[PDB]
Subunit: 353 residues, 4 copies
């Protein structure tokens, strides 16, 4: 009862990274990360397991750039296994590949009667990682599913989430998860925080969960709330090993969403998997759209470029240095307004702003 209000949470717009001594240019920093010893990325960027972000074209484009795509689960078992199989069979100097030289891929599952059959067919399609993808990962049903998957497939890479506390992170890892996916409500189209009243500001969520994961030698995926390339530097410096992106990739050519025309501008639909449209209720997502942006490679190049620039300012030669050594400073809303362009009429913006 007395402790009810002591905790304080920060998100991306509350903080800046403090520059430090640099000896490594942005172009020479190392962006590789091992989520597990058999799940290695050359850039710390994952496309979300959402029906408006990732099917095989997005998963192929992401692995060719050294990242990872998660095939969404809003499709039949047989359809999802075929999508994984198309990525595995695809035929890019930064490409992330398995021991057989095939592009890496992941696939989402839920906690339903079907889960173990879905996992079996995805493993037979040589998926590199399963994502146990739920609204509330800190739940007995989720812990039971992690355990049953880990028992059936002792070497299978498992990402489980979503969570936002040290205690939940601990519980998923004790059940057998390799990677904990962090974020409760920060998503661009998510309304969890408003309709349920629940969540943790994302920089605090990442930091608290990464602090726990490090005790177990496991890794974090920072899922949600990222709006700019600098938010990637921030998410990783807070402890994340890799980021997961939805809205920043939903407008790209390889995303599966419907196109919409409005005021002569092309958009693609972007919607929550908690929206009335995706689950088909008391919804925890809404439906929106984001401008058409062209090939995902051009968006990734700008996002990775901002990350490399941030690492050069922090003097981080690699992502371990960024996670372990980078320092934040807290800012007010006046700090935030100074950090964006201000007091000038803007005519032309940039790919990255």
């Amino acid at each position: 009862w007395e402790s009810k209000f002591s905790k304080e949470g920060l998100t991306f717009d509350d903080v800046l990274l403090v520059p430090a001594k640099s000896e490594v240019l942005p172009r020479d920093v190392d962006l590789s990360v091992e989520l597990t010893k058999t799940l290695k990325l050359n850039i710390p960027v994952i496309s979300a397991g959402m029906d408006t972000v990732t099917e095989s074209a997005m998963a192929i484009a992401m692995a060719r750039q050294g990242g990872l795509g998660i095939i969404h689960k809003n499709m039949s078992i047989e359809q999802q296994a075929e999508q994984v199989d198309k990525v595995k069979r695809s035929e890019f100097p930064n490409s992330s590949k398995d021991i057989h030289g095939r592009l890496i891929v992941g696939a989402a599952v839920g906690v339903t009667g079907d889960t173990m059959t879905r996992v079996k067919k995805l493993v037979e399609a040589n998926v590199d990682v399963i994502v146990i993808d739920t609204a509330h990962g800190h739940s007995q049903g989720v812990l039971n599913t992690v355990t049953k998957i880990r028992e059936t497939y002792p070497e299978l890479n498992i990402i489980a989430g979503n969570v936002a506390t040290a205690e939940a992170t601990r519980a998923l890892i004790e059940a057998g998860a390799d990677v904990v996916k962090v974020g409760i409500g920060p998503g661009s189209i998510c309304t969890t925080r408003v309709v349920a009243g629940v969540g943790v500001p994302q920089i605090t969520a990442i930091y608290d969960c990464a602090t726990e994961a490090r005790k177990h030698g496991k890794t974090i995926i920072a899922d949600g709330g990222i709006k700019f390339s600098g938010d990637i530097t921030k998410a990783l410096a807070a402890g994340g090993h890799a980021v997961m992106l939805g809205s920043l990739l939903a407008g790209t050519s390889e995303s599966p969403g419907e196109t919409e025309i409005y005021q002569g501008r092309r958009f693609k639909v972007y919607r929550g998997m908690g929206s009335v449209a995706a689950m088909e209720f008391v919804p925890e997502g809404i439906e929106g759209r984001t401008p058409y942006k062209g090939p995902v490679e051009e968006t990734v190049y700008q996002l990775v470029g901002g990350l490399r620039s941030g690492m050069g300012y922090c003097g981080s030669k690699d992502l371990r240095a960024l996670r372990e050594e980078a320092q934040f400073i807290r800012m007010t809303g006046a700090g935030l307004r100074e950090s964006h362009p201000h007091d000038v009429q803007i005519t032309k913006e940039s790919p990255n702003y």
Copy 2:
């Protein structure tokens, strides 16, 4: 003189609930609450004693859903007794009923020369609870009226308010109140905070008053400031036993307000009982309108659904667990902006957002 500035107050938008381990699904949590041992709700939701929110149709619809309606006092004694009598005589598996199987109902009274005659006629109409409904419950006139009612009717359920401090809560309970109604200025159409300069941010008000009420074994109604279903989770986790709603129910079919057409959209009027229109001055309310929303059952279903979702995230199997165990985290305005949808063009919203 020195203590003048130390206290700090929080409201709904300052805080989020921290998720915890869940073993009970949203659909299986228990939403029942005893405001007194003879005043039991199956959902913790009360319609306000306002002439734009509650007469008998609203009171009937609320009790059929397991909640409670307070008949407003802007009508004759004989009119208010007839309204109570229509609810009692009304003829819904979650319905909240008295020992004779009749829907529960409440009725508001003020502190005037008439009060004891109004109370007598409402008791003869078998009202389940009286609400002593005043702007400043921490006043000698209010304490004297609580005492005279409690002396005349030793078993009558009494709600008294409004207050926002432990000391006021203590005083109303010492006079004989069963339930303390909390809120000074958070109402959608209230201007108390601006025209008088007075109030307490509502989450702090609820917490401080619930901390005192628990010492006396009494209950709190969180009255005002609720805009979304998640604010209900927050109000109850702060210590409230039940919420009281005005603006969220004023647009519903069963509300008594006038309809208004504007830009081809139907609204209903919503006004303070401190507005120049309702009292008929130096007013402490203004007049407004809110969109027509259809049957109150559909609004209650979405509000209760968000509460159940929040309880599943908090791992609360019932409202006692939510009040006693749920933890908050404080957020900045940047936290709040992350918690709402952001950085996407919204086309379609949801019943609950």
Copy 3:
């Protein structure tokens, strides 16, 4: 060097007054205040010494209501003496009058070669109080003028300002001031804070200066930043004995400003005495207008009504109880947004909001 950033300042919108036990109704509270033993108000409200707020009509209307008008100094010595003489000769149960039954009045002077001649003619016109009215009261020139006036006129009431610190308050009182006028930059049309970079948030300014003034048995006028009736409750609870108003009275019939028509609405001009227009530079005011509001009595009645309501909520039977006993609570921007009307379409406002 190390102390440069420790101090924190609050203004009106940072705080609310905490309700307390009331035994005295708003209508029965006492609003009288002695600024000095020979300068007594029946309501704690002073019209500003500005060429868009106070000449004799405003000074007469204010004293008839129990307040005070300060005749501005943007006119000849002989003109200002005649204005004082018209108020003194004017011929209202709350009227504030001198020992000869004549309405009280004040008049502004600056620190120039002319000051002592201006003061002589105002005293010969039986002015009740001189206001030494400067941008920076904590200046050697101002202290020398206070001393020369106090030496020449041992019984003359002297208001001196403006200041915002305990040290400045101490210095003006040591020179011979009876009343210290507090406010550096909070004025509606003031730009001191932006063009000079200087100021103190007004609730902190009032509190710090009142804390010092009490040590000397002297009084404070809270000058500037008041937008609503509740800000008057706040200013006095922070330590002010009386408030000084500019923009809230500039639209009233008795103000001297020019009228302007815009979008079929009548306005009156309101401008700083630090604006290029009033001084005739590097200006510290701009020029604006405020809607025509009718007779000053109707505005004062609403402002005083909000003050009385706040005092009833605080349980303050008189202004000494409000200054000495009332407690504040700090709120965020979310607190402020809850305190105003919110989440309803407003059709009709009130005289006081």
Copy 4:
């Protein structure tokens, strides 16, 4: 890992300067500053080394007013040497001049293969100061260039930057810099903070770097984020010896930018040297424009006037008193809203607001 979030940063809009006892009128304060013993300004204002702010006309106008212009480096070595030579040969009672009675001037260089040849030609053109002008001054490449310049030219004035920490300030001074230029991301058209995630709110940056520079007997230039004359008082009171301005001077006659017409108003272009347009990428600037403002002397006169007014309020007889003695108070967003004009319709603004 544990220290990641403790630091807090402030910028201009977070703070106000506390008025103090004044004996020196604004018109009589001393505005001179020695950046080095051979680099003396009569006003503490420097025009930025940007291709939309400073070539020879701006450098001449700034030195005639007692300030300094930095010739930008987006031009050939031979072009930049000619610009310096035009200022040196130019033929104003506050003019800042070298020992030979010639207007002072500076010139920017980068860290490239060409740098030492550029510096040689600028020194042969009798430049008064070199600015080693980089995005991240806390970098080995920058430290090596400072050392090579200082070794080749033992008496040459060197400004080096940009930085935002004590450690970076220390490193540049140990390499041989005389003056450290402070600012990482506060620029009107800068996007460093958003695309890289990095920076320090500018008042904190100035204070931390000035605290270190004082230990070495060196000076700070506060570069970026200044929007109003009062922000100059603030920057210098935080520890800066002089300010550097870009957007506030880009609209003036002497700036080199292109003119643009929009809605019958004349503008000049203002763009980052990190924008795609200026470097010719992953850009850290965007492109904008600012209204045409007339001769730079009229803008400087208003900026210097606001500084003098702030110094009179602080009781600072000279800039050393302002840097060493002036105190700040922290304000909320409500403080900031009170500090600007508010609650009045503005018709006419002022040159300085």
